Amino acid sequence: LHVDVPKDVTRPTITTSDEPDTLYKRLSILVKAHDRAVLDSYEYFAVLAAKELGISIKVHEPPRKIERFTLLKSVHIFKKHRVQYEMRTLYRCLELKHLTGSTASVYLEYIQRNLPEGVAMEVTKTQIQQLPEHIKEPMW
Amino acid sequence: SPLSEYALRMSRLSARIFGEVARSTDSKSMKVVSLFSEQPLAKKKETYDWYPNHNTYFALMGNLRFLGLYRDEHQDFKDEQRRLKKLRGKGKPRKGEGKRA
Amino acid sequence: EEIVIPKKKTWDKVAVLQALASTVNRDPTAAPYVFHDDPYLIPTSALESRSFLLAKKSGETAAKFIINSYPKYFQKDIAEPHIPCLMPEYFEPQIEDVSEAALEERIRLRKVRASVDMFDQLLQAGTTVSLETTNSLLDLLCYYGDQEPPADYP
Amino acid sequence: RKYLFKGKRLSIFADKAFADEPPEPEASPSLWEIEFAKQLASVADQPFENGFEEMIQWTKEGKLWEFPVNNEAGLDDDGSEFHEHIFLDKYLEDFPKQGPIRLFMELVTCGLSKNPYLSVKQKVEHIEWFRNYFNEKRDILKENNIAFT
Amino acid sequence: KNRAARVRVAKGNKPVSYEEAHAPHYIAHRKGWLSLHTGNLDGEDHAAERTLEDVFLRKFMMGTFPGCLADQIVLKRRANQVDICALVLRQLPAHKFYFLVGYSETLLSHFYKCPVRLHLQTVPSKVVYKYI
Amino acid sequence: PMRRKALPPRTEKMDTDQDWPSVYPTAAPFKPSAVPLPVRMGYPVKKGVPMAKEGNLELLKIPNFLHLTPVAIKRHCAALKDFCTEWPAALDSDEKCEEHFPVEIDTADYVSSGPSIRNPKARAVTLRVKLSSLNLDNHAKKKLIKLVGERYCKATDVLTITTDRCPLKRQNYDYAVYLLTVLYHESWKTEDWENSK
Amino acid sequence: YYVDWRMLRDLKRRKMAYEYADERLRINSLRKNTILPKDLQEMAGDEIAALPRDSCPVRIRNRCVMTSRPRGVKRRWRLSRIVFRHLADHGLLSGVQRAIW
Ligand SMILES: [Mg+2]
Ligand SMILES: [Mg+2]
């Protein structure tokens, strides 16, 4: 828009509660896809998004898995003649560190809502909390 | 090696805490725990919902064809083969009036 | 020594989408989002704009008619969580017995003539009817002025 | 001159020292109030301006999943607790306190505690079934020297 | 000789699209996949249900747009959203497409209990990759 | 009854200094009439060039990132900053975290495409605590290590409690915390039969 | 309409096994142990036998959902080898390709 621009855009209401926040020591995001190029583009979007919000991120590529199975090519007899099929799974692991519970929800929503078709995520949150108050003091 | 009293009494204290079988149970009697801890084969969604509802698809699409919102090339092909076959006198006989009396 | 943990912020389920929406502005070279984004399907004139939307509303009503008329084919629910707004609707009373409860159902469904018949039948028997229930009937009749709610069907 | 908020007023009413004394839902929403609200929404009802506004509406209607994804969204097993699922020996009080029936029900209740696919109500039904089963077989049990209830 | 999904040679007068020209061994090499979901990835469930839904969704669009489909449809699943991307010939009037889009979306959203959207790109005529 | 004519593509009216994020606000399919780029895709025929964007099924088959561009992502995250909360500065190291927060709770989420959001693996929970963090007497630590069996790792001195028996994640989480409390309190208790070791 | 009468019989077998799953579990648990009197086990051995034969879950056969083929089926997709190859060889299965190596 050249001349016609919003004046005071409405922004969502964020209210700070009195409950303490979760503390995630680690947060591993394992994305899976049949296509390597899609993971490269998603890895760029996720690393850029993390860096813009202040999150610390690292990336590595777990070894790919190829599952192969054999089928019978003909409809009837001709046993020795087969057709083989495979499904390839490729992985990109985004290991985040030192996240509060509010930072991990907004980030995961933003990147989960933009998860391309054919891509599956496996978030593995690792929370750190104090000891139970009963355990803190031995009681007989 | 054998399990001494301390070893055996510790094992029972552990099972009691972790909700495991506490007594000495034969392999045969451990199936009762397996039967009641695992979903039976007939109760799994893969088993009872193995098939799509073939009645819902066939009925729904047939109704849409009669409403003019779906076109079944396969049915139109068969509907015209029946028309031509009936003209040739090879149509379906009426029930109870077949060639054999 | 004791660490200070930050106080967790909270927001509505749609809050994140609302924030992302605020960033984007109207596309000056595109037709309204309702209209299909294809050169063949973009409304050239103002008459086509209304016609294109009325044809869309007509197709939505044709589907809702089929879903509400053959509900048995639209009853399998495979959505977790369950989506209430994607289930067939039922508007006809399913309580057959003639009781104050049955009248209340018809009033809830907003049927005017059927409710009057069951109210009169209740009076014919003489069974007690609550003043609050009798008011729910008058509300329906007074608001719709004794005429069945407007609707469109074959 | 024509000041919008400077000048004489009707003065029939007085300043509302008391405000909204009667609650808004004085009665359950009537057809009149339920229908007026539907019309107020239509006043500001405009079509979607982008895919974000469409997704927001689906979210408000439950059509679209909420994010971040929760695989147990809306899935509460009657608001139970872990101790309800795990400790099930309270329901075996009717059964003999010792003997073969107790030994068997111990194995039954051990499996039920390790069952994540059943609710507490369903697990109790399995226990109740055996209670009635052994009651019917009182005569066979007595022959084997087992006394039930 | 292999016959699977192979449009055979005639006398150089048979138009074939890019999708039709390429035999099965070119899948993942020269041409991609028409459906993209997460059900065939490693350690994923509900492949059978995604595959059955696709078979139906393709027969539905063929009948609902008879003679108006220039190429096979592309199905894209994101979260619980379904997206159908079809190349459609410009045969029908414009207002008729708006009817079939509203109808096909509402009907398939109340049948599979998911939000379904239809994306139509209109072509002047079928695109010919090569004459074989 | 003249046939309808298609309008010229709207890319023609697009300036080179436009606000592209506004053009593709959200994930959409590739629209050759809205993407102002002469992109070509397709294995070319001999003496031929790759196919053009219009009527290109291959470009439609791609999960494009047009909505996610470096300009959009930076503008998006700028709005999303208000949501984030600051990590406590004191916990600048992993060792510092173990001192004040010795208990590590592992929970897993799964995101897939389909009508159902349910995955059986989401119920499982895993608690990890180091025995050094727990206040254990020489007697208690030996009793704790014998009861837990293989859950304890001598090399790392970490106790691992994995709970998936309960249906929900909030139940499995509360159960592992319970298992720790009973094991700790039981370890301190001394039984008469223990003197016969 | 289902594909054939064989698929129809299978569907009924799958729907009657789901109804009798809890019952056949509770009764069969009384038999798969060594802790209960053999007289009770012999009587439970006949209560399970008296249940209808279609409740037995070993009478279910996995058939192609689209052609009702009893053998050649792949359990992950519930399709026969012939039907699977038609969808795979046309690019219609998401992520399935030919195996060259
Ligand atoms: Mg036949
Ligand atoms: Mg068999």
Swiss-Prot record, chain B:
Composition bias type Basic and acidic residues, residue spans: 94-101
Pfam family, one: MRP-S33
Highest taxon, organism lineage: Eukaryota
Biased composition annotated in UniProt, kind: Basic residues: 83-93
Compartment(s) where it occurs, according to its Swiss-Prot or TrEMBL record: Mitochondrion
N-acetylserine: residues carrying this PTM: S1
Transmembrane regions: none
Key words, A-Z: Acetylation, Mitochondrion, Ribonucleoprotein, Ribosomal protein
One record GO biological process: mitochondrial translation
Residue segments, region Disordered: 80-101
A GO cellular-component term linked to this record: mitochondrion
Similarity comment: family membership: Belongs to the mitochondrion-specific ribosomal protein mS33 family.
Quaternary state and interactors: Component of the mitochondrial ribosome small subunit (28S) which comprises a 12S rRNA and about 30 distinct proteins.
Xref: PANTHER family: MITOCHONDRIAL RIBOSOMAL PROTEIN S33 (PTHR13362), SMALL RIBOSOMAL SUBUNIT PROTEIN MS33 (PTHR13362:SF2)
Protein name: Small ribosomal subunit protein mS33
Gene this protein is translated from: Mrps33
UniProtKB/Swiss-Prot annotation, chain C:
Span within the parent record: 56 to 209 of 685
Residues annotated as transmembrane: none
Subunit structure: Component of the mitochondrial ribosome small subunit (28S) which comprises a 12S rRNA and about 30 distinct proteins. Associated with the 12S mitochondrial rRNA (12S mt-rRNA).
Function, in words: Mitochondrial RNA-binding protein that has a role in mitochondrial translation.
Protein name: Small ribosomal subunit protein mS39
Annotated PPR repeat ranges: 95-129, 130-154
Organism per entry: Mus musculus (Mouse)
Subcellular location field: Mitochondrion
N6-acetyllysine: residues bearing it: K72
Membership in a protein family: Belongs to the mitochondrion-specific ribosomal protein mS39 family.
Disulfide linkage: none
Swiss-Prot record, chain E:
Subcellular location: Mitochondrion
This protein's record includes keyword Transcription: no
Entry keyword set: Mitochondrion, Ribonucleoprotein, Ribosomal protein, Transit peptide
GO cellular component: mitochondrial inner membrane; mitochondrial small ribosomal subunit; mitochondrion
GO annotation (BP), single: mitochondrial translation
GO molecular function terms listed in the Swiss-Prot or TrEMBL record: structural constituent of ribosome
Subunit and partners: Component of the mitochondrial ribosome small subunit (28S) which comprises a 12S rRNA and about 30 distinct proteins.
Family: Belongs to the universal ribosomal protein uS3 family.
Name of protein: Small ribosomal subunit protein uS3m
Curated annotation (Swiss-Prot), chain G:
Any one GO cellular component localisation term in the record: mitochondrion
Disulfide bridges in this chain: none
GO BP, sorted A to Z: mitochondrial translation
Transmembrane regions listed in the UniProt entry: none
Keywords carried by this UniProt record: Mitochondrion, Ribonucleoprotein, Ribosomal protein
MF annotations from Gene Ontology: structural constituent of ribosome
Keyword Mitochondrion: yes
Subcellular location: Mitochondrion
Similarity field: Belongs to the universal ribosomal protein uS14 family.
Subunit description: Component of the mitochondrial ribosome small subunit (28S) which comprises a 12S rRNA and about 30 distinct proteins. Interacts with LIAT1.
Name listed for the protein in its UniProt record: Small ribosomal subunit protein uS14m
Originating organism: Mus musculus
Classification of source organism: Eukaryota, Metazoa, Chordata, Craniata, Vertebrata
Originating gene: Mrps14
